Each structure stands twice: as structure tokens, then as C-alpha cells.
Amino acid sequence: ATLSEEEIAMAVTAWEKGLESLPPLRPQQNPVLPVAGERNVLITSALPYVNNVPHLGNIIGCVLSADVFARYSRLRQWNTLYLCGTDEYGTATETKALEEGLTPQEICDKYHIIHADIYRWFNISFDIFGRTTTPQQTKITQDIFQQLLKRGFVLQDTVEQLRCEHCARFLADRFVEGVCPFCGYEEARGDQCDKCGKLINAVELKKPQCKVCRSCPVVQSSQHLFLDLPKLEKRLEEWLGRTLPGSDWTPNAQFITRSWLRDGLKPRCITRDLKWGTPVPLEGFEDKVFYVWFDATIGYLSITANYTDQWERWWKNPEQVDLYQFMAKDNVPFHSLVFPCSALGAEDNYTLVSHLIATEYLNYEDGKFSKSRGVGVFGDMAQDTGIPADIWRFYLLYIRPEGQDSAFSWTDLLLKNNSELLNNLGNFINRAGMFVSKFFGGYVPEMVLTPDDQRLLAHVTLELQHYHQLLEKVRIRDALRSILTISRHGNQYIQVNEPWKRIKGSEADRQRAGTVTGLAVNIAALLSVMLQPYMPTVSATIQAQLQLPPPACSILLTNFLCTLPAGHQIGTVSPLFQKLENDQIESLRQRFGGGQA
Numbered sequence: 001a002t003l004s005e006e007e008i009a010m011a012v013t014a015w016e017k018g019l020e021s022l023p024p025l026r027p028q029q030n031p032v033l034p035v036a037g038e039r040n041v042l043i044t045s046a047l048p049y050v051n052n053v054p055h056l057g058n059i060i061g062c063v064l065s066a067d068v069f070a071r072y073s074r075l076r077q078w079n080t081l082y083l084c085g086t087d088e089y090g091t092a093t094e095t096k097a098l099e100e101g102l103t104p105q106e107i108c109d110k111y112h113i114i115h116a117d118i119y120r121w122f123n124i125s126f127d128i129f130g131r132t133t134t135p136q137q138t139k140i141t142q143d144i145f146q147q148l149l150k151r152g153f154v155l156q157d158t159v160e161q162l163r164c165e166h167c168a169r170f171l172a173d174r175f176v177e178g179v180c181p182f183c184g185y186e187e188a189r190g191d192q193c194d195k196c197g198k199l200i201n202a203v204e205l206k207k208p209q210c211k212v213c214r215s216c217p218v219v220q221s222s223q224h225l226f227l228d229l230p231k232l233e234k235r236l237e238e239w240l241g242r243t244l245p246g247s248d249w250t251p252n253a254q255f256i257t258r259s260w261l262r263d264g265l266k267p268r269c270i271t272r273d274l275k276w277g278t279p280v281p282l283e284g285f286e287d288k289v290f291y292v293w294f295d296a297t298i299g300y301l302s303i304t305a306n307y308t309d310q311w312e313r314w315w316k317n318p319e320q321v322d323l324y325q326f327m328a329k330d331n332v333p334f335h336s337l338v339f340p341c342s343a344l345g346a347e348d349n350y351t352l353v354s355h356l357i358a359t360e361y362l363n364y365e366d367g368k369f370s371k372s373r374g375v376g377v378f379g380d381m382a383q384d385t386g387i388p389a390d391i392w393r394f395y396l397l398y399i400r401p402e403g404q405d406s407a408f409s410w411t412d413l414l415l416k417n418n419s420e421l422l423n424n425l426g427n428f429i430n431r432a433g434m435f436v437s438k439f440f441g442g443y444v445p446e447m448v449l450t451p452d453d454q455r456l457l458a459h460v461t462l463e464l465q466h467y468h469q470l471l472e473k474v475r476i477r478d479a480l481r482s483i484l485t486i487s488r489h490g491n492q493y494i495q496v497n498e499p500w501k502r503i504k505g506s507e508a509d510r511q512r513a514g515t516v517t518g519l520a521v522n523i524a525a526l527l528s529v530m531l532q533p534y535m536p537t538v539s540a541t542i543q544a545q546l547q548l549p550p551p552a553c554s555i556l557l558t559n560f561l562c563t564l565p566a567g568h569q570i571g572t573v574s575p576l577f578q579k580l581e582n583d584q585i586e587s588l589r590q591r592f593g594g595g596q597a
Ligand SMILES: [Zn+2]
Pocket: 180, 181, 182, 183, 184, 185, 188, 193, 194, 195, 196, 197, 198
């Protein structure tokens, strides 16, 4: 395409300015804390439930999406804190621990390691990967509760529940049978009678029976606490009306939030009759814990608290901190309604989310991931495929479900690997490094820019600015395509100039070959940095092959610079990517298809 004279002029000028356009990068901090006058970016990924092995769908929607923005944020020299951790409390944990013959603490410890190992293999750059089963979780949850309680946002009511005294617990509708009080059907459930269709309350059943021990449950009244959401609806919508417009909340999250408010919020129970949970500091609640519906989102705070006692500088500092929250759309109500209401009702100057990033679902082939049916790739099986992490990262991010659902496809993975990585991105960077190493003893040639060279340079800068424009608004999927667009321009540039041929010609031809070569390898250097949020290992590999200086590796400016000036010596080059074969892929497809085992 055609650009203005000034656009080209500005691009060339910035490019020639070279390495000292780079600011002397600040030394890393631990713990990372907000700096006044600078941008401070707080990033959370939704806390995965601990006792389920995560699959690719879980990873792309949360930890991997958050990782890309986190890495980009650091390249922009923003003070970045990316945190996550395992969600561990609840009835599900008690049930699963029983099935595995372990204590709740035991099975949680076991599966936390599994999560941590999986995310470590996928190279997720957490600043903290924590847990919700800590004393700080208890302290911070109880504090927020007290603040809400003393401001009249907590209700207390009695609820009639069936209780199996033999099993010593309150029964869910699932585990209750009885006679229908409407038609006399003898096998009615606690939730509904399948004979007459009537939706009932389990407490209304005649001759109720526990499905487990077959004894007779009794109706007992138990005390529960409720969060008074209707009273908080006003201050919540004030905040939303103030922060939603002009934000980068994903459209699906915005619709979901508004749709809940249209129906009107109701008081929600925040207590449960469990043992495994955060204790409630109130009289008569010694055998009750906080419902994970309420305190799971507080986990973000306690995880940060275990990281630094200065955690309030992040989570109680809205004027300084921009919070990004990544999740799948199911988690949206807890992040757009529940915690904001709790925080706003606490009146403790809490940092609320500025940009809620919610994805749609990643499906597997023509259906769902399923552990029970053995369908789909789960996080712990990825390592065993012979396909490295960055390849998984590339494909998942290439098909990241942003506007609509996406589907993992083995055929598509092979096709996009061979076409975009091998025949495009890899083919450019391989040739750029090869030409330097083969024709110039590993030294970057002198670059004498022709008008055509200046055009390409300017095109690269404009696409780079497009890349920034997108990722600034968390347009992950499209920013990856900007990278591939640059390498596409680069391949076209190399192919039309044929430097590997001209190098065998006149001294004029040889100078052209040198210019093309040096310019190409500088584009290769830029790509390595742009690629870092997406494929961190490949990024490091390229930078090692080109011996790109560390300050150039850790910052991405909005202009295309000459990071590899003439005379710079590169290392030893080697093909970046391996092709994927039909035999290899069909074997993997059959393995995770469900037709086996
Ligand atoms: Zn009935």
C-alpha cells in the first residue's frame, strides 16, 4: 500500500536513531509495587477449581489469555503484577476428598501441585500462584464481612432444611426421595416430581428418605447470613455507569452484567453448613462457613497478601491501579456484581476492575471436553504429545474464542503450524539469520536504504503501531495476526530482492544484498520481541540466535528501531519450527478422540 511522505520520513528517522532511543530499563522489583506517576497494571486470572485437572479450554480463557497481556504489559514498562491461584474450598472438595480417601487439605495440596506444574510447562509468568486456603483468606474475608455487617448489608434468616441425622448433614435435593404431596408418586425427588411434573420444595415431601443411608431425614431450622444486594444495587450501578463507557470490557461481559441488573438483584446466601471453608465470626455459626459464592473472589486479595504485606497498595488504591480481570463468561457475574457490591458496601476504597476480559468457550472438535468420556486434551497430557508448549500457545491464541465459540481441531493445528509458522514466520526469520551467517561471517552488513527499503521500513512501523493499538485494548487474537503480517511483508521483501543471488554479482548488487539482509534481520529482531507474549520460548531462541542485547529484548517501543546495527555479530542460526506430519497428528487425534479406552 501507499503511505505519505512524512509517514515514511518519521519512520526512517526513528529507525536510524538506533539503540539509544531505548531508555535505561529499571531493575526488577520484588515484590512489584505501584509507582506514582507511572502506569500500574494489576492483572488477575480466574482461580481454577483445584480438584479438577484443567483442559485447553480452561487454559485459553484464563491463565494463557492473562499471560499474554501480562508479558505485553511488562514490555511496555508498566508496573505489572500478574496473580492467580487455586480455588479450593467447598462441598465439591469434601466429596472428592472422600472418594480419594484423603482429607480436604490433602487432596487440595495434591492437585495444587498438578495445576502449578501444568501452568509452569505452558510458561505462564505468574508473579504469584497462590491458594485460597490460608489464614490471610480468613482474616480478609472476615474483615470485609464485618464492614458489610456494621453498615446494614448483611441479613440473617432461618431456613428449613432436611437433615439426615444418620449421615449427620443437611441433604441437597439430589439426595432426597419421597412421596409427592400432589399426586402420591412414591419416588419423587426433592426438586421435582417426575410423575405430575410439579416443581416442589424437598421439605414438602411425604415420608422423605435419604438416598444414601435410607433413613428418615427431619426438618431442622438453621441460621444463615445473606448479602443484601438490592440495597447495594444503587452504588453498584453508579460505578458501572462511570466505568463501563470507553472501557475495554468485552461485549459479552457487558451484556451479561446489564441483563442481570434488568432482572433486579436479590439477597444471596453467603453461608453454608460445611466444615471445609472460611469460618464465620458470629455466635451460632461455629459449624458454618462462608459460601464460596461470596469469598472465592476475595481470594485475589489474600493471595496478594501472602505475597506482600503491602497488598493494600494494590487492592485499596483505585486512583493508581488499573485492574484487568481475565475469565470465561461464566465467571462474569462474580466479578461484575458480587465482589463490586461487597467492596462498595465495605467502603474501604477498594480497587475495582477497570477492564473485564471475558472469552467465549473453546470446544473440542465437534463437542465438549470430557474427563469421564476421555475426550479432549487436558493440561497434563499436553507434555506427552511431543508437541512443545509454544506450538500449543500459538494455535490456542490464534483461535482464541473472543466474539464467538471456537473449536480445537487437530487438522487445523497441523495446517496453521505448517502454513503460518513453517512457511511464513519461520521461513522469514530463518532466512534473515541464514543470510547474515552465510554471506557476511555473522556480521550485520551496512544498510544503504533505497526508496523501496524506506517504504518497507515504514510499513513495518505502521503494522507495529497496529499491534500496539490492538494489544492495548486486549485484542489478543488480532495482534497475533499483525505479527504474521509483518513476516509476510518480510518474506515478500526477500523474495523480490533475491539477496542470495545478488550476493554473487557486481559490487552494486552485493551492496543491495547486504542492505536487504541487514534490514531483514532487524525485522527479525523486532518480531522476536513482538512474539514474546505469545511464544516466550521461541522468542528467547531467536534472540539467542541473533544475540539481541537484553535491553532490546525487554522493551517494545511504538517505533521500529535498528536494534542490530551494521557490524553487530549474531550467534549460530537454526530452523525455528518443525513441520507437523499427518501420521503424527492422526495418532494424536485418535488418542484424545474418545474412541480409545
Ligand atoms: Zn407428583
